[PDB]
């Protein structure tokens, strides 16, 4: 853990605390070590309607990164870890198949 | 003739009930697939117990004789069974050399000092053994060259006799108007008991390497693999005791050859020292009238060591 | 010359032929087929010039097999040869793939045992019980040593299964983008509440002080932890392990999981029916392979054999005249009975202390396994791992836990490419 | 105490069947678990307290 | 061999030794249990291949010279020059030593298969069928995996190979 | 021990040798179990 939690960032689940590992700080204890684990925890979710792809000109468009969401009347692209909608453009997506 | 036993001569080693328990026992048995002599008679040895099977619907076997001398001047066992029941008896007998209207019992002509009395096709098996002065008999009568199968034999008697046995004979009913003899050896078996408590199968733990594996694992089904079961130990032969030669034979040769001996009142006195010794010249000297040795025997005069001679 | 003797058997359900190896014995000093190996002399098997896969290992590269109605020896083969068509401008690229599912079994816990030292050593005997006072605090050590490792056995099972705060449930409409999970989810019509696959896992597997303690968690309680993990990973993916469970449709979860291994997401969406058919058949093959668990049976057998051996040491004399305490003292002389009873106490105490030392050595092996099983639970089930071979063979997509009597079984789902072609 | 067999425990009616020469039975691991009463000739199990 | 250590082939001692029960069966089981795991430990470290991969007869690779880790037929047991250096630096009463199941030749075969697999197909054979790719391109992908762009390898191919060969 | 003692006196001396040698052999095997767990743990790291 000193190597993988303190000298770097780990993707190992629950190896460096609960949540998404950001960083850790060591402290000395008598005959032992204490790790202060800093994690990222999401909060306050909302529900949305989604779809895997969007049709335009008879072609299927898929997101480069993110998910399609609908607020009730319009559809947007968002990143998966924080709600931040942008308009769906040809620079945000790629084409594959019909 | 000789025949091949299959799995015969297995008897209940003791009391003690028991259920489904692959129990391992060590005792005196008839080894499986053994070489059993065949007789259709002469005094046979005993040495350690006896297996005795036979086959016949009628009753040709009319008792046995046991003991050390099979003669008078000492006590012996005699087992007979007329149409009534078995009669154990231990007296000093005088046996006919050929023992055998409808009148019978020409076996003996003396029954002195009796110390025990008692009164009361087909396969008739017996197991005889004699341990700590107790003469045990196991038997079973099961209706049908012997066939092939397994059947455990139950105790019949318990006889606190004290009798020694080294030889025995048999008795047959002649015509006027077939039996087997095995012996027991110390072997180990793995005995399978059913839920009723009877012995249904056995493994001889000193036959084919596979049986040694079964006995070590305590099972009759061995799974594929390799099993360490025992060990190989080369044995030494002969006993060679090496030693020196002699050198300073420490010359007895003058004290027994001094030309001028000494009168008794002033007797000479020579003391041996730490030198070589060999009394074989004395004992084997050939000419002597008196030679008596008080402390140690005359032959062990070399297997010892003393300080001052 | 001396050495061990081993017996090579194909199994009594195959044949009764056997060969014998005399370990490091020269073939001239043993007292057909005699074969000399660096491990000794093998008699009763023929040596061939072919090479097979190893079946029964003999040693030094030699194995035995029952193939060529007899018994044979041979130098096992490591595998088939393959030359790779390497060049400096050639590449092989797959055009198709298969979904593979494999199992992995790990022991988590073992039987909790305690022994009352007084009933083992003395067995309801007041003369012996007072003599135990002259040995000090040996029983104090014995009780603490066995209790200290019995408490860890419940901790081992909490750390593997109790990794979820909420008890998650699946919707009644059990149908996920075409994937059929009914063999791994609880089936409302069975003993307690097991999946059809867990039923195979559970169906395939007061003397004189020697007491067995029950586990803290029952098998019904472990099933409820494993069904909550299954519901979370199917409805919420890997989000419930970092906060609140966030719903997402399953077809979209699988597309994310392909992205995480280097495959674009359109490859799944245009082949969704194929991947669902391949997954559903792959899961159905698991019950055939189960209807294996030696890693769990070994734990039960090793402890049972230690408990039986401990009892059997109660019939040793250890240099006394009798093994029975109600015998010695009764017929002998008290001054002498005391010395002989002390020999029985010492011999039986040494047996019991040996038992405890081996339980501490075995407890560390179960804890090491339980730490690995807990690590796999978080990194294989609550997420997607990139560690090679850690979560099954192939590119890790997902895992589903199943409970076992004293352990846990992981079902690993991996992506395996197939049908490569040559390109410049 | 049954003519030499010394022990402690609860005596109960059994359902075993000894052979007509056997006094007592043992279990696996060779511990006495049933006896026969010399007088009444009935088999009794000897569970522990 | 328990008996040969404690008594040493003496019938008086060995008969008295029987009075202590089955200690000599426990000793054998304990030693057998740890002697079987010694081959299991080796088997699980090296047997990480199904096929035995061989390298091509030519050996250009890209500038890299792996001749110090690959087998040399002219050396004993066909070890590499470095596997030879490693093996160049590193009876009685009832006591025996059991041979391993895997010989040193068999272990060299496992390591040469791992070495032939990775130099020609990278890491692909550990997930499925072995897929060949030129070695120079394998190195460029490996730099990409650590956050370095691909042109840094391709424009410095001779420099990276020279540093490797010297190291 | 079997040459300068009668059988009832030699048994006592043989038990002393058995106890001592058995204790030493049982210690030997226990220490190997303790070391065997360590090589196995190392082999698991090498395999990883
Ligand atoms: C998103 O919508 C779902 C329903 O589709 C909400 O879940 C419901 O939550 C309410 C309030 O806790 C419960 O009473 C219902 O039983 C839930 N429905 C189901 C089907 O479980 C969920 O809470 C919504 N999320 C947010 C942030 O509002
Ligand atoms: C979804 O979000 C959109 C964008 O915010 C809302 O639509 C309106 O969009 C026009 C531009 O086309 C803006 O000028 C308006 O201000 C937007 N209105 C609002 C209220 O934001 C739309 O209302 C949202 N839908 C729902 C159901 O809330
Ligand atoms: C005393 O001396 C005589 C002769 O010197 C010894 O006689 C020898 O006896 C052996 C054994 O029979 C013969 O083989 C020799 O041939 C004899 N000697 C001669 C010269 O014939 C005699 O042994 C001596 N006394 C003792 C006790 O040894
Ligand atoms: C890749 O390897 C091939 C051989 O497998 C090379 O082709 C050889 O190229 C050299 C010149 O570099 C010629 O002299 C040989 O005659 C060629 N061999 C054959 C069989 O045609 C090729 O040049 C290599 N590529 C690179 C970039 O080095
Ligand atoms: C990819 O491979 C799979 C087989 O692994 C192919 O699917 C099989 O195709 C055959 C021939 O049409 C059918 O008979 C089988 O029933 C199919 N199997 C399954 C599980 O559906 C698939 O066609 C291949 N894809 C391509 C593009 O060739
Ligand atoms: C998922 O698979 C299960 C079997 O594992 C299917 O259940 C079987 O369905 C057929 C058709 O009704 C029956 O003949 C079998 O008896 C069922 N098996 C059991 C154990 O009940 C189930 O139908 C599948 N689900 C879907 C949606 O296809
Ligand atoms: C790619 O091309 C190579 C040849 O450059 C093929 O190699 C063949 O390999 C087999 C054994 O698998 C040999 O028996 C043939 O002799 C080889 N052919 C040639 C022309 O050398 C290789 O099979 C091709 N790969 C694929 C996936 O088709
Ligand atoms: C020992 O003696 C008792 C009597 O003291 C016998 O008991 C008899 O048992 C039979 C059944 O077997 C009964 O029908 C009798 O009524 C009993 N008699 C009495 C007085 O109760 C017992 O059978 C004898 N045991 C043996 C082995 O003979
Ligand atoms: C691989 O590189 C090594 C050097 O690292 C080459 O081996 C040496 O080459 C020099 C000449 O350049 C000789 O003087 C040495 O005697 C060589 N050493 C040995 C052990 O032979 C080797 O030739 C290179 N391989 C190829 C195929 O070029
Ligand atoms: C039994 O051994 C004798 C020699 O003692 C031999 O002559 C006889 O053939 C053997 N019997 C059998 C059946 O092998
Ligand atoms: C049976 O034999 C015994 C012994 O010789 C004898 O005492 C008894 O009277 C015999 N019985 C008959 C009916 O002859
Ligand atoms: C045995 O019988 C003889 C007479 O034949 C007799 O002198 C002797 O006293 C008897 N022995 C016993 C113990 O009765
Ligand atoms: C049996 O004979 C042996 C000698 O072979 C003897 O020592 C022993 O005392 C005899 N037993 C009886 C009961 O007479
Ligand atoms: C004897 O065993 C058989 C099975 O082999 C069983 O059916 C029968 O009931 C048993 N008899 C008794 C009296 O228990
Ligand atoms: C084992 O025996 C059973 C019959 O009892 C048989 O069905 C099975 O095929 C056998 N196994 C082998 C490996 O021969
Ligand atoms: C066995 O001994 C012979 C000489 O008698 C020798 O030639 C042979 O090499 C020995 N075998 C082994 C395996 O040492
Ligand atoms: C195996 O091949 C060798 C030659 O490599 C030959 O000498 C030997 O006889 C062969 N063995 C058998 C059993 O045919």
Find out whether the beta carbon of B37 lies less than 6 Å from any atom of ligand 10. Answer: no
Q: How many angstroms separate the most distant Cα atoms in chain F? A: 63
On whether any CB of chain C is under 8 Å from the CB of B235, the answer is no
For C373, residues 6+ apart whose C-beta sits below 8 A from its C-beta are: C106, C108, C160, C407, C408
Residue of C207, C307, C313, C327 best to disrupt the D interface, most CBs of D under 10 A: C207
Closest chain C residue to D30, measured at CA: C312
Please report, for chain A, how many H helices and E strands are present, in that order. 0, 7
Determine whether the interchain pair E134/C91 forms a contact, defined as Cβ–Cβ distance below 8 Å.
yes
Range list of H helices, C285-333 = 286-290, 294-312, 325-328
As beta bridge partners, residue C19 has C8
C370: DSSP letter: H
Determine whether the interchain pair B15/D28 forms a contact, defined as Cβ–Cβ distance below 8 Å.
no
Q: Are C128 and C341 in contact (CB under 8 A)?
A: yes
B265: DSSP letter: G
How far does chain A reach from its first CA to its final CA, in angstroms? 48
Q: Are C33 and C71 in contact (CB under 8 A)?
A: no
Mutate to test the pocket of ligand 5, among C93, C95, C96 (most ligand atoms within 8 A of CB): C96
Distance B190 CA to ligand 10 centre (A): 27
Determine whether the interchain pair C84/E20 forms a contact, defined as Cβ–Cβ distance below 8 Å.
no
Determine whether the interchain pair C361/F15 forms a contact, defined as Cβ–Cβ distance below 8 Å.
no
DSSP for E33-83 reads HHHHHHHHHHHHHH---SSEEE--S---TTS---TTTS--TTSGGG--HHH
HEC string of A4-38 equals HHHCCCCCCCCCCCCCEEEEEEEEEECCEEEEEEE
Phi, psi of B124 (to 5 degrees): -125, 100
Find out whether the beta carbon of C195 lies less than 6 Å from any atom of ligand 6. Answer: no
CA angle B122, B124, B130 (to 5 degrees): 175
CA angle D19, B127, B57 (to 5 degrees): 90
Residue of D5, D7, D27, D29 best to disrupt the C interface, most CBs of C under 10 A: D29
User: What is the C-alpha to C-alpha distance for residues B171 and B80, in angstroms, rounded to an integer?
Assistant: 9
Distance C29 CA to ligand 17 centre (A): 25
- Using a CB-CB cut-off of 8 Å, the residues of chain C touching A60 are 266
Which residue shows structure tokens 């008999």?
A: B137
- Using a CB-CB cut-off of 8 Å, the residues of chain D touching C206 are 48
C380: DSSP letter: I
As beta bridge partners, residue C6 has B228, C21
Considering every ligand atom shown, identify the ligand nearest to the alpha carbon of residue B280 and give its number: 3
Nearest to E138 by CA among E151, E155, E119: E119
Resolution of the model in angstroms: 3.8
From its phi and psi, is residue B300 left (phi > 0), alpha (psi between -120 and 50) or beta?
alpha
**In this structure, which residue's CA is closest to atom 9 in ligand 6?**
C182
Per the entry, the structure determination technique was: cryo-EM
Q: Two tokens at C178? A: 């075409």
Beta strand E52-54 with C81-83 is parallel
User: What is the C-alpha to C-alpha distance for residues C220 and C226, in angstroms, rounded to an integer?
Assistant: 10
CA angle B237, B243, B244 (to 5 degrees): 155
User: What is the C-alpha to C-alpha distance for residues C398 and C217, in angstroms, rounded to an integer?
Assistant: 27
Mutate to test the pocket of ligand 6, among C180, C186, C188, C273 (most ligand atoms within 8 A of CB): C180
User: What is the C-alpha to C-alpha distance for residues B57 and B122, in angstroms, rounded to an integer?
Assistant: 5
Ligand 4 nearest atom to the CA of residue C89, by list position: 1
User: What is the C-alpha to C-alpha distance for residues C91 and E109, in angstroms, rounded to an integer?
Assistant: 26
Question: Which residues of chain B form beta strands (DSSP E)?
Answer: 2-4, 23-29, 35-39, 44-45, 50-52, 61-67, 75-81, 86-95, 108-116, 122-131, 134-143, 154-155, 159-160, 167-172, 179-181, 185-193, 199-204, 225-233
HEC string of C121-143 equals HCCCCHHHHHHHHHCCCHHHHHH
Determine whether the interchain pair C86/E55 forms a contact, defined as Cβ–Cβ distance below 8 Å.
yes
**In this structure, which residue's CA is closest to atom 7 in ligand 14?**
B196
Determine whether the interchain pair C361/F33 forms a contact, defined as Cβ–Cβ distance below 8 Å.
yes
On whether any CB of chain D is under 8 Å from the CB of B155, the answer is yes
Q: Are C279 and C269 in contact (CB under 8 A)?
A: no
Q: Two tokens at C37? A: 């190996």
Going from the N-terminus, what domains does chain B have, and what CATH number goes with each? 2-232 (2.60.120.960)
- Dihedral, C176, C179, C185, C186 alpha carbons, nearest 10: 80
Closest CA of chain A from C252, distance in Å:
7
**In this structure, which residue's CA is closest to atom 5 in ligand 5?**
C98
CB-closest option in C319, C354, C365 to F37: C365
Q: Are B134 and B125 in contact (CB under 8 A)?
A: no
Nearest to C344 by CA among C362, C317, C379: C317
Determine whether the interchain pair E120/C91 forms a contact, defined as Cβ–Cβ distance below 8 Å.
no
Determine whether the interchain pair C358/F37 forms a contact, defined as Cβ–Cβ distance below 8 Å.
no
As beta bridge partners, residue C128 has none
Give me Rg for the CA atoms of chain B.
31
CB-closest option in C24, C354, C418 to E96: C24
B275-to-B226, B256, B293, B307, E105 alpha-carbon distances in Å: 62, 17, 22, 11, 66
**In this structure, which residue's CA is closest to atom 21 in ligand 7?**
C85
Q: Residue E10, exposed/middle/buried by CB under 10 A (0-12, 13-18, 19+)?
A: middle
Considering every ligand atom shown, identify the ligand nearest to the alpha carbon of residue B105 and give its number: 11
As beta bridge partners, residue B126 has B52, B139
Find out whether the beta carbon of C424 lies less than 6 Å from any atom of ligand 4. Answer: no
Find out whether the beta carbon of C14 lies less than 6 Å from any atom of ligand 15. Answer: yes
Q: Are C14 and C55 in contact (CB under 8 A)?
A: no
Give me Rg for the CA atoms of chain F.
20
User: What is the C-alpha to C-alpha distance for residues E68 and C178, in angstroms, rounded to an integer?
Assistant: 54
Q: Are C281 and C99 in contact (CB under 8 A)?
A: no
Find out whether the beta carbon of E151 lies less than 6 Å from any atom of ligand 9. Answer: no
Residue of E101, E109, E119 best to disrupt the C interface, most CBs of C under 10 A: E101
Q: Are D47 and D27 in contact (CB under 8 A)?
A: no
Nearest to C243 by CA among A41, A47, A40: A41
- Using a CB-CB cut-off of 8 Å, the residues of chain D touching B18 are 25-26
Q: Residue B90, exposed/middle/buried by CB under 10 A (0-12, 13-18, 19+)?
A: buried
Determine whether the interchain pair B226/C7 forms a contact, defined as Cβ–Cβ distance below 8 Å.
yes
**In this structure, which residue's CA is closest to atom 17 in ligand 5?**
C274
> In chain F, which among 1-48 make CB contacts under 8 A with chain E?
2, 10-11, 14-15, 17-18, 21-22, 25-26, 29-30, 32-33, 36, 39-40, 43-44, 46-47
- Using a CB-CB cut-off of 8 Å, the residues of chain E touching F36 are 34, 37
Determine whether the interchain pair C246/A45 forms a contact, defined as Cβ–Cβ distance below 8 Å.
yes
């Amino acid at each position: 853990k000193m190597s993988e939690c303190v000298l770097g960032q780990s993707k190992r689940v629950d190896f460096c605390g609960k949540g998404y590992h950001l960083m850790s700080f060591p402290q000395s204890a008598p005959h032992g070590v204490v790790f202060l684990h800093v994690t990222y925890v999401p909060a306050q979710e909302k529900n949305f309607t989604t779809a895997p792809a969007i049709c335009h000109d008879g072609k299927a468009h898929f997101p480069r990164e993110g998910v399609f969401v609908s607020n009730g009347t319009h559809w947007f692209v968002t990143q998966r870890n924080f709600y931040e909608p942008q308009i769906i453009t040809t620079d945000n997506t790629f084409v594959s198949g019909n | 003739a000789y025949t091949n036993s299959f799995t015969r001569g297995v008897y209940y080693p003791d009391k003690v009930f028991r259920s489904s328990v692959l129990h391992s026992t060590q005792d005196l048995f008839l080894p499986f697939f053994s070489n059993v002599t065949w007789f259709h008679n002469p005094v046979l040895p005993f040495n350690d117990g006896v297996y005795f099977a036979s086959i016949e619907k009628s009753n040709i076997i009319r008792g046995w004789i046991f003991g050390t001398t099979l003669d008078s001047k000492t006590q012996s066992l005699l087992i007979v069974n007329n149409a009534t029941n078995v009669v154990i008896k231990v007296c000093e007998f005088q046996f006919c050399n050929d023992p055998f209207m409808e009148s019978e019992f020409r076996v003996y002509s003396s029954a002195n000092n009796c110390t025990f009395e008692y009164v009361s096709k087909n396969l008739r098996e017996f197991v005889f053994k004699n341990i700590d002065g107790y003469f045990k008999i196991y038997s079973k009568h099961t209706p049908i060259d012997l066939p092939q199968g397994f059947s455990a034999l139950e105790p019949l008697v318990d006889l606190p006799i004290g009798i020694n046995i080294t030889r025995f004979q048999t008795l047959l009913a002649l015509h006027r108007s077939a039996y087997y003899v095995g012996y027991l050896q110390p072997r180990t078996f793995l005995l399978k008991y059913n839920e009723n408590g009877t012995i249904t199968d056995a493994v001889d733990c000193a036959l084919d390497p596979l049986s040694e594996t079964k006995c070590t694992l305590k099972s009759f089904t061995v799974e594929k693999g390799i099993y360490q079961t025992s060990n190989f130990r080369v044995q030494p032969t002969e006993s060679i005791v090496r030693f020196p030669n002699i050198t300073n034979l420490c010359p007895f040769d003058e004290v027994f050859n001094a030309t001028r001996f000494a009168s008794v009142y002033a007797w000479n006195r020579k003391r041996i020292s730490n030198c070589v010794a060999d009394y074989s010249v004395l004992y084997n000297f050939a000419p002597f009238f008196t030679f008596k040795c008080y402390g140690v025997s005359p032959t062990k005069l070399n297997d010892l060591c003393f300080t001052n001679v | 010359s001396f050495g061990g003797v081993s017996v090579i058997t194909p199994g009594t359900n195959t044949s009764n032929q056997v060969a014998v190896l005399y370990q490091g014995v020269n073939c001239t000093e043993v007292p057909s087929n005699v074969f000399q190996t660096r491990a000794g002399c093998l008699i009763g098997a023929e040596y061939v010039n072919n090479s097979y896969e190893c079946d029964i290992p003999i040693g030094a590269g030699i194995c035995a097999s029952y193939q060529t109605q007899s018994i044979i020896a041979y130098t096992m083969s490591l595998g088939a040869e393959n030359s790779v068509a390497y060049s400096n401008n050639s590449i092989a690229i797959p055009t198709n793939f298969t979904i593979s599912v494999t199992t992995e079994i790990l022991p988590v816990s073992m039987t909790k045992t305690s022994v009352d030292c007084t009933m083992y050593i003395c067995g309801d005997s007041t003369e012996c019980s007072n003599l135990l006072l002259q040995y000090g605090s040996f029983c104090t050590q014995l009780k603490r040593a066995l209790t200290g490792i019995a408490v860890e056995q419940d901790k081992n099972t909490q750390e593997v299964f109790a990794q979820v705060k909420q008890i998650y449930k699946t919707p009644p409409i059990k149908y996920f983008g075409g994937f059929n999970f009914s063999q791994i989810l609880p089936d409302p019509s069975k003993p307690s509440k097991r999946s059809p696959i867990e039923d195979l896992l559970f169906n395939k597997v007061k003397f004189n002080g020697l007491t067995v303690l029950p586990p803290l968690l029952t098998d019904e309680m472990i099933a409820q932890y494993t069904s909550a993990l299954l519901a979370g990973t199917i409805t919420s993916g890997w989000t419930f392990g970092a906060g609140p469970a966030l719903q997402i449709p399953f077809p979209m979860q699988m597309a994310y999981r392909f992205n995480g291994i280097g495959v674009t997401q359109n490859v799944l969406y245009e082949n969704q029916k194929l991947i669902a058919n391949q997954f559903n058949s792959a899961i159905g093959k698991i019950q055939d392979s189960l209807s294996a668990l030696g890693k769990l049976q070994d734990v039960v057998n090793h402890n049972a054999q230690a408990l039986n051996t401990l009892v059997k040491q109660l019939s040793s004399k250890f240099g006394a005249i009798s093994s029975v305490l109600n015998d010695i003292l009764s017929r002998l002389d008290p001054p002498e009975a005391e010395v002989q009873i002390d020999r029985l106490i010492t011999g039986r105490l040494q047996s019991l202390q040996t038992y405890v030392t081996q339980q501490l050595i075995r407890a560390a092996e179960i804890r090491a396994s339980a730490n690995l099983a807990a690590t796999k639970m978080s990194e294989c089930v609550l997420g997607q791992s990139k560690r090679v071979d850690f979560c099954g063979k192939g590119y890790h997509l997902m895992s589903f836990p199943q409970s076992a009597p004293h352990g846990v079984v992981f079902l690993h789902v991996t992506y395996v490419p197939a049908q490569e072609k040559n390109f410049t | 105490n049954f003519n030499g067999l010394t022990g402690t425990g609860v005596l109960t009616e059994s359902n075993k069947k000894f052979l007509p020469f056997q006094q007592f039975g043992r279990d696996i691991a060779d511990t006495t678990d049933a006896v026969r009463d010399p007088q009444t000739l009935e088999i009794l199990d000897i569970t522990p307290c």
